[PDB]
Symmetry: C4
Subunit: 381 residues, 4 copies
């Protein structure tokens, strides 16, 4: 996990959302020293447990109420239970990763500080801060608007199904914990995306520096710069590996949540489109599909960009080789080429899969297979 | 995108079809200088928007008519809507790529000019021009014949379903925009195929030159020739990467369109074969299947050939190494081998997949899975 | 294609079966010179066309008879038509490959002669001849027994369905061409398996020679032997590539035929097991499943073995490097290691897939997917 | 297969379970010499045959009884038959591997002895013995508890279905052989997991030794140590290959058994959850699902860990290269890097698949596809 001053807002968001139980102090040098915060550790654990318990209690209450709102039919019951469980698992994995990833965070931040010192010429504090804050604000505003629309639609629906001998508004009220879990999930995804995008951006800056310092006494300093760039590349690869070892289970559960959410939301939209019983519900389902796809991209695109930027440095090094005649510089470039030959750049989600754009294709196939089956089941019943 | 004098006819076809908004002037040296053409840029954008709007308006009119011709049943409505939407997305992606790919086109054409100067001995202006014109004419004639057959069959069908209190011929007339979109798609596919086949042909010419100049004072010029060949190989790889970065979304949407078209056309053919209500409709559906498969091959085979030709140069270089004793020539061949070791030859469609013949197998599986399901749905209903 | 004296029996079998239209003369040196045989070329083409026409004519006659035997229901009609068409396509592809693969055959046989001269110490004429004849005899006897069982079972069935106003035995008689196509397919598969197994066996002999001459004046001859072994390895790789370029479409159609045959035969067996209307039919279906799986292995295992044997030579070369101190021998071993680093050993079926054991797993999944669907369709109807 | 004094308990368990027909004598040096034990060879073969025959006889008796307990419906009959057959095949493959893998076992144990002598500094006899005994005891206790729960639940069920004119308790008694087969399968899986985890642990110890002896006269001994470490790495790779060549069919059948068991157990749990006819049966089905998933991990995680540990040594070697200046040590590290460049670390199950965590994802998809279909079939019927 990345904790930097420009992105300190995302860190605070994750901290109040039970995902970053760390205490950060800004040194007089502008560096952010990080340590364990037991107060926030226990706060995060207790909040996660309490919110999960409340979410499942509300689910049971809806299922066991006089007039269930969402948990009405067996198919609807199972689909909504899976929808809640995927979010619960994703947030639990994120919280667990944030709790037991302090050493990885420290190592990643030290490596990033060294790399930024190496790549100080391409650092943009203002632009990085604004990008991080914009991404966080957009994600939070989108999820807030979507939650408001969903809760209003479900409130209106429950009012339509209201009977004088029972209150169905409380059934919708009891689903608030699920939306809180959604906010926590949004914060976790924002943090992961920020870290991965930072790694990819640093890879791109390293490649730009390589191409601008070698393709556009003195040779000794140039070789020193090349050695520093190679060290930065290896350190960025190790930072990617640390991010994987820390949040791979979280990313895997986020991907599973995206898949199941797309399937279930498409199924519900198809149901409402066949019955044509409501229109706001249909539009809210389309908005949910768009949000789920956007967050799937949020978790996929960063790793793909990082791998792409890291794997294109070898071509630059080959060009340098073909355009370098100095002995020691040629040897340094040869060392860099050998180092790049054996880089593991792709992001691994606990070894289950490689997080890149190809996953999307697979997802589509899965969404094309399960959804249809669900439609077939609906026709059968 | 490739814009060369031999293939200038394909460029003009794409230009009048809203896919190549570029102004080309032939220099006194025989070179084609390319620049932005704002008149044709706005013409392409406006034509694309207007034709898409007309296509969807005709779709809605058919769906909302007294006697729908194609958009009659829910299954038929959805299938025809997807059929129109895939074409719309493919042409929109092609137009967008042509609008925002001027720099890539310029770089690709400069690289191709340099490579052709390097490989001037194997250039065939007459044969290249005739191949390009033949491919373009065959594609346009096939799509025109297919559109005529489809529109005539649908006109006859609508006449069969005609009732004295409504006109169903106008419903078929309103589908003309969809066929115009088909023509635009054919032009885009022809342009992409021409560019990719040119890249693969240049790879093959480079390999032939390598095998004929090294396996079938003077050594200094031979090493110079080898350096030029290696530069041409790297430039061809970069041209493939430019073509990908420019038209990957277009190729991905073309592949999706081919998949969904094969599925839907097979479903319609199966419907008519069960009902046995018509024969010309069945034959037109078979012709559509053949056309879709042929264009899928048109978009797949070029990339596969390019990758195959680029990946077989390393064996030639190894043979040269084993058959070269000169010091400087041996060093140049070693450099070439190292360069070839790390080439990314496969064509990437926005990173979602690698465009090669293997895709076809996957496609078959997909076509075997979805189609069957659709058949199962038909049986259920 | 391989044409050697030990395996000349397989060549003659393929020749009388319209798959090897070549004239072979044994030189006084024991070498087999190969040339085009126009008499057998036209014989093969005419026989293939005539047998395909007769097979489809018998299919139509069964479908259009008073009491169809096999082509009775729409599902049965489609399944039997696909069963006949896959065999027809496989044999047509094999015949086409044999017709237009004379140059590849000549090159492969020259390369194999050179390799055998290099590996003369491990050549076993008697064992190779006996293995080839045993494989051919086993395949032909198995297909003959299976055809006899199938035709007898279908004759008995047609007698059971016989009515005084029609003869159903002629319907079974008209399916003889399909069994002739099966014999041709068996011959083609035997030839392909013999060639691929020969390539893999030569790879294994090369590896054994490497391990016995280097891991178990004089150094100059040892380096000469190593150079010959490296040349033999590259020549075996090129022979594999020639076999692919010649019979890849045939192997692809054989794989498709195996897949569809397994699916259809399992479906028919499941039908008869639900109806429990016959027992000999069930056992014949199990025998057909076993034969199809055995020939799938016959076409898969050879390529897998060849790739495995070719890819394990690099480890032997690394051991030699770690155990070689001589300068020129060390340089030769380094050259061999570099050559082995970039070998394309896997067999490619026209680029659609890599023929190895992994395919089997995919096949299973496919057989698990389509078959079930077919069962689901049967339940629906 | 690994046979070491710390894990001698697992060896004895496998020996009395018909999986390790070897006689082991502990030498005065503490080494375990291994040889063939014909008494235990015939005991293992006879026990396997007898238990398989009894299992299938009990299956038939249940199917042919007055009141079948498990083999009642066609769907239930097929599912239970497949459940028994997968276990039978897995245990038969394990027994066959143990019978015909004496040479591989001897080679693996010699290699492991040499490696342990090389890595003596990181050997922990007490910890290894306790881990092996704990894994064996946990597996055996879990399977025993699960078998007791299953047999008690089925006994109670058969008592519920008891009629005065027939005894259904004997039907459950006749399924004891299936549980004995389950115990044999658990022993085989424990042995395979122990061997693979030992290989991965030795890989990790080798990497730790590399990082602690090079990254945390004398140079000659350091190079000797590096040569020994490289030899140990190659020997561990060859040990992994021996384990594959010996037990790949067993691992493949174990994976198939896990897949089919998960599918069938989930189907049965879904059945009981729809009928809601019992609760203990539901909980036993959940326990069975957990046990099957845990053993799938038991067979997958070891190979993944071994490959991961073996593939991360190249990065350590690159760091050593970048941090080594001595001539002979630099040459040794270069040799080690070249050796590591071409390592085949992944475990292969007879070439059908690579055993790693990715398989799990595929499994899920399969479980998501077949299970649903089975549910669809249940709805249809
Ligand atoms: O199920 C449809 C949508 O409703 C939600 O549960 C929100 O309450 C989302 O998880 C899903 O996208
Ligand atoms: O749907 C069957 C065929 O009809 C078309 O829509 C043409 O109007 C094609 O897209 C398709 O191949
Ligand atoms: O269809 C079941 C079996 O019958 C055959 O058609 C033989 O006539 C085979 O192709 C198939 O294995
Ligand atoms: O089928 C459900 C469960 O019952 C068993 O057969 C045990 O007797 C297991 O193989 C399976 O997990
Ligand atoms: Ca499926
Ligand atoms: Ca169905």
């Amino acid at each position: 996990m990345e904790i930097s001053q420009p992105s300190i807002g995302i860190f605070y968001i994750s901290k109040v959302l039970a995902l970053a139980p760390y205490a950060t102090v800004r040194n007089s040098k502008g560096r952010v020293e990080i340590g364990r915060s037991w107060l926030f550790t226990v706060y995060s654990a207790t909040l996660t447990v309490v919110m999960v318990f409340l979410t499942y209690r509300g689910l049971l209450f809806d299922a066991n109420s006089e007039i269930p709102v969402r948990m009405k039919s067996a198919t609807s019951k199972v689909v909504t239970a899976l929808d809640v469980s995927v979010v619960v698992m994703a947030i639990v994995s994120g919280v667990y990763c944030g709790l037991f990833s302090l050493n990885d965070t420290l190592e990643l931040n030290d490596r990033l500080n060294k790399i930024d010192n190496t790549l100080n010429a391409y650092n943009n504090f203002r632009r990085d801060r604004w990008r991080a804050l914009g991404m966080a604000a957009v994600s939070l505003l989108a999820i807030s608007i979507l939650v408001g629309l969903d809760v209003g639609t479900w409130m209106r629906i429950a009012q339509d199904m209201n009977i004088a001998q029972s209150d169905t508004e409380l059934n919708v009220h009891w689903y608030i914990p699920f939306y809180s879990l959604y906010f926590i999930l949004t914060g976790l995804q924002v943090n992961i995306a920020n870290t991965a995008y930072g790694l990819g951006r640093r890879f791109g800056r390293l490649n730009r520096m390589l191409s601008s310092s070698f393709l556009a006494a003195a040779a000794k300093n140039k070789g020193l710069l090349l050695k520093s760039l190679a060290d930065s590349h290896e350190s960025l690869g190790k930072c990617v590996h640390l991010l994987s070892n820390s949040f791979g289970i979280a990313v895997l559960f986020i991907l599973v949540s995206c898949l199941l959410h797309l399937v279930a939301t498409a199924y519900f939209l198809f149901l409402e489109l066949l019955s044509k019983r409501d229109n706001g519900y249909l539009w809210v389902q389309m908005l949910w599909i768009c949000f789920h796809f956007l967050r799937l991209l949020m978790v996929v695109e960063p790793c793909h960009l990082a791998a792409r930027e890291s794997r294109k440095t070898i071509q630059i090094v080959c060009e340098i080789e073909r355009k370098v005649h100095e002995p020691i510089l040629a040897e340094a470039v040869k060392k860099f080429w050998q180092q790049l030959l054996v880089v593991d750049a792709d992001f691994s989600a606990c070894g289950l899969c490689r997080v890149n754009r190809t996953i999307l294709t697979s997802f589509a196939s899965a969404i094309a297979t399960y959804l249809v089956a669900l439609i077939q089941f609906q026709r059968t019943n």
